[PDB]
Design an enzyme around this catalytic site. Sequence first.
Site, PDB file in Angstrom:
ATOM      1  N   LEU A   1       1.167  -3.176  -6.874  1.00  0.00           N
ATOM      2  CA  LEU A   1       0.826  -3.091  -8.280  1.00  0.00           C
ATOM      3  C   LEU A   1       0.355  -1.682  -8.611  1.00  0.00           C
ATOM      4  CD1 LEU A   1      -1.131  -6.431  -8.692  1.00  0.00           C
ATOM      5  CD2 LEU A   1       1.330  -5.999  -8.870  1.00  0.00           C
TER       6      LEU A   1
ATOM      7  N   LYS B   1       0.895   2.218  -9.142  1.00  0.00           N
ATOM      8  CA  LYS B   1       1.933   3.179  -9.501  1.00  0.00           C
ATOM      9  C   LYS B   1       2.003   4.308  -8.480  1.00  0.00           C
ATOM     10  CE  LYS B   1       0.929   3.602 -14.030  1.00  0.00           C
ATOM     11  NZ  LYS B   1       0.717   2.235 -14.599  1.00  0.00           N
TER      12      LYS B   1
ATOM     13  N   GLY C   1       0.821  -1.192   0.000  1.00  0.00           N
ATOM     14  CA  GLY C   1       0.000   0.000   0.000  1.00  0.00           C
ATOM     15  C   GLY C   1       0.859   1.247   0.000  1.00  0.00           C
TER      16      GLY C   1
ATOM     17  N   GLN D   1       1.138   4.256  -5.363  1.00  0.00           N
ATOM     18  CA  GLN D   1       1.676   3.772  -4.097  1.00  0.00           C
ATOM     19  C   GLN D   1       3.187   3.604  -4.172  1.00  0.00           C
ATOM     20  OE1 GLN D   1      -2.239   1.381  -2.227  1.00  0.00           O
ATOM     21  NE2 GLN D   1      -0.634   0.272  -3.335  1.00  0.00           N
TER      22      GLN D   1
ATOM     23  N   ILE E   1      -1.160  -7.526   4.315  1.00  0.00           N
ATOM     24  CA  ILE E   1      -2.414  -7.078   4.882  1.00  0.00           C
ATOM     25  C   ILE E   1      -3.337  -6.513   3.819  1.00  0.00           C
ATOM     26  CG2 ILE E   1      -3.446  -5.500   6.548  1.00  0.00           C
ATOM     27  CD1 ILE E   1      -0.605  -5.505   7.917  1.00  0.00           C
TER      28      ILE E   1
ATOM     29  N   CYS F   1     -20.121  -2.051   2.699  1.00  0.00           N
ATOM     30  CA  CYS F   1     -19.237  -3.021   3.333  1.00  0.00           C
ATOM     31  C   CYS F   1     -19.377  -2.998   4.848  1.00  0.00           C
ATOM     32  CB  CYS F   1     -17.785  -2.760   2.936  1.00  0.00           C
ATOM     33  SG  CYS F   1     -17.458  -3.064   1.188  1.00  0.00           S
TER      34      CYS F   1
ATOM     35  N   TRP G   1       3.873 -10.380  -6.174  1.00  0.00           N
ATOM     36  CA  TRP G   1       4.673 -11.399  -5.515  1.00  0.00           C
ATOM     37  C   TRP G   1       5.077 -12.397  -6.594  1.00  0.00           C
ATOM     38  CZ3 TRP G   1       2.564 -16.116  -6.515  1.00  0.00           C
ATOM     39  CH2 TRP G   1       1.201 -16.136  -6.839  1.00  0.00           C
TER      40      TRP G   1
END
Length: 285
Positions: free
Chosen positions: A93, A95, A72, A97, A134, A267, A121
Amino acid sequence: NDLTPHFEDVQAHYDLSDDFFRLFLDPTQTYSCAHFEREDMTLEEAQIAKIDLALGKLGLQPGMTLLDIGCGWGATMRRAIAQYDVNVVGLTLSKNQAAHVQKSFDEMDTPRDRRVLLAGWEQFNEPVDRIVSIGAFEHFGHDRHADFFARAHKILPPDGVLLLHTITGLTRQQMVDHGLPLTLWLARFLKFIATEIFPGGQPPTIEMVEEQSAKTGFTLTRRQSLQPHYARTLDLWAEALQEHKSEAIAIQSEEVYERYMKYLTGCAKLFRVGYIDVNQFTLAK
Ligand SMILES: Nc1ncnc2c1ncn2[C@@H]1O[C@H](CSCC[C@H](N)C(=O)O)[C@@H](O)[C@H]1O
Ligand SMILES: CCCCCCCCCCCCCCCC[N+](C)(C)C
């Protein structure tokens, strides 16, 4: 070869705009379930608590190299350096971050090694001492769980540990056990998340994590749920964004504003009702 990261799906969310995310995330830009240890703890204090909770289970010692898969905005790694004095390597993944983590690393005045790679990974094969992940697993895709654990197992030392923090969905039977109904709203909301929020998002079920990680050779020394904490984390994020409605509209649009408010509040209901859970799996080789 093969198994090339799902950059587009993951980036469609995290590369939206750092300014936008800054409107509702806590100052550390942690984007995952917090851990309110003290009832009146602020979101930032609870996020730091969740960080320490995950990190403290790894058995980190000065000089070790900690890999954060799906780092992150880097708060976890930066905290690992200060609190455990370990070197850090982060994968993302996103950019935005990557640029942000890099910048924050440069501004740090520590002797510990630290880098962030714009990669998955699946593209990482370097030996590391411990691994923390996480809120990244949900993006991996069920079809890659097995390969994920194999890699984590491959790069960890013989007594290595993996702290896998991830959202877990209840199986259909668990929902029945808990008296939770399969409503049209639920299916509709889930489709919404997969279509406008987290394309490719496929949270695992608890048994999936246990079974797949066991096949690879990991021992689940502990599973800890933070379920009640996510609803609250989500309420806080929702509220902050709402408090920044005009700023959100300016930076993006009313459409995006409403999309995220719909996602955040939706959520929060999932965890509140209990359709979804969130767990920390301490996996030891
Ligand atoms: N296959 C993959 N390899 C590496 N990182 C991945 C990934 N799929 C998703 N991610 C990353 O996982 C993160 C999800 S957001 C969670 C960020 C951070 N761990 C926190 O707790 O705040 C993003 O950084 C995303 O880029
Ligand atoms: C805060 C996000 C909650 C998601 C709850 C479940 C909804 C349906 C499944 C979506 C799977 C994607 C999960 C991505 C999680 C991303 N973040 C770690 C940053 C929150």
